[PDB]
Amino acid sequence: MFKAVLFDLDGVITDTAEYHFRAWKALAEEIGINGVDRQFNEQLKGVSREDSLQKILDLADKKVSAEEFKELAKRKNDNYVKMIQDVSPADVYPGILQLLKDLRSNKIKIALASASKNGPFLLERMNLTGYFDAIADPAEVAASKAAPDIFIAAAHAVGVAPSESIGLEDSQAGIQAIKDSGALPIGVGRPEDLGDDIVIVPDTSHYTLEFLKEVWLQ
Ligand SMILES: O=P(O)(O)OC[C@H]1O[C@@H](O)[C@H](O)[C@@H](O)[C@@H]1O
Ligand SMILES: [Mg+2]
Ligand code: NA
């Protein structure tokens, strides 16, 4: 049986991928870059703050100063942080709280493998911190998603090998990171976005312990 579940946060535990998108789109348009639509944003999900800004700047081959780059990232974060202040336990996606309780009851470790430095704050907002055995610090890894490092770190933080873990993800970059870690990915979203080569569920209510067990078996 699998021994750990490695959770992405944004777009898996709650609808904060929507808020990252809105904040990045607003920032892009302030600097005159209009290509950040929902389709392009699939390339941004799971990606670090700095890599997200760089991918946006790459759209118009746009060149800002180092000072401007830092200020733009800060501006986006300040906006995002304001948008999430009213997140509450009511915003936890369907099925997720039950899954956490069921994993815990079955002595399966629970780790966060989010690229977001706002992850710990969001778990507190949602009253979820006590369910997590570990949070992998996205600033500590040498390589961010789509590199596997954060998933490897999350597994190791709970004393489990990635090969004994399931990873839950809503993003292309994160699914790739799970694949390259050795853990088993189960995506949530559209195969059109996430691929036709791994198990994908249409919504988080499908993330039941019972379903995870069967995926593991097969
Ligand atoms: O800017 P933060 O909060 O550190 O988040 C970093 C990244 O965190 C990931 O969880 C999100 O999918 C990305 O959209 C985001 O860019
Ligand atoms: Mg995500
Ligand atoms: Na406008």
Numbering used by the authors: 1 to 218
Original paper wording:
For complete catabolism of both trehalose and maltose, the isomerisation of βG1P to G6P is catalysed by β-phosphoglucomutase (βPGM, EC 5.4.2.6, 25 kDa). βPGM-deficient L. lactis is unable to grow or has impaired growth, when the sole carbon source is trehalose or maltose, respectively. βPGM is a monomeric magnesium-dependent phosphoryl transfer enzyme of the haloacid dehalogenase (HAD) superfamily. The active site is located in the cleft between the α/β core domain (M1–D15, S88–K216) and the α-helical cap domain (T16–V87), with closure of the cleft through domain reorientation occurring during catalysis. Two phosphate group binding sites are present, a proximal site adjacent to the carboxylate nucleophile and the catalytic Mg2+ ion, and a distal site located ~8 Å away in the closed enzyme.
Taken together, these results confirm that βPGMP146A can assemble a stable and wild-type like βPGMP146A:MgF3:G6P TSA complex in solution. The 6-phosphate group of G6P is in the distal site and the trigonal MgF3– moiety mimicking the transferring phosphoryl group is coordinated in the proximal site between D8 (atom Oδ1) and the 1-OH group of G6P. The donor–acceptor distance and the angle of alignment are 4.1 Å and 174˚, respectively (compared with 4.3 Å and 176°, respectively for the βPGMWT:MgF3:G6P TSA complex). The catalytic Mg2+ ion coordination also has comparable octahedral geometry to the βPGMWT:MgF3:G6P TSA complex and to substrate-free βPGMP146A. Together, these data demonstrate that βPGMP146A is able to populate a cis K145–A146 peptide bond and achieve full domain closure with concomitant formation of transition state geometry. In the crystal structure of the βPGMP146A:MgF3:G6P TSA complex, which mimics the transition state of the phosphoryl transfer step, the K145–A146 peptide bond adopts the cis-isomer and the sidechain of K145 is able to engage in the active site. Hence, conformer A remains the preferred route for phosphoryl transfer in βPGMP146A, despite it being ~1000 times less stable than in βPGMWT because of the trans to cis isomerisation of the K145–A146 peptide bond. In addition, assuming that βG16BP binding is diffusion controlled, the increase in Km for βG16BP in βPGMP146A reflects the energetic cost of the trans to cis isomerisation of the K145–A146 peptide bond.
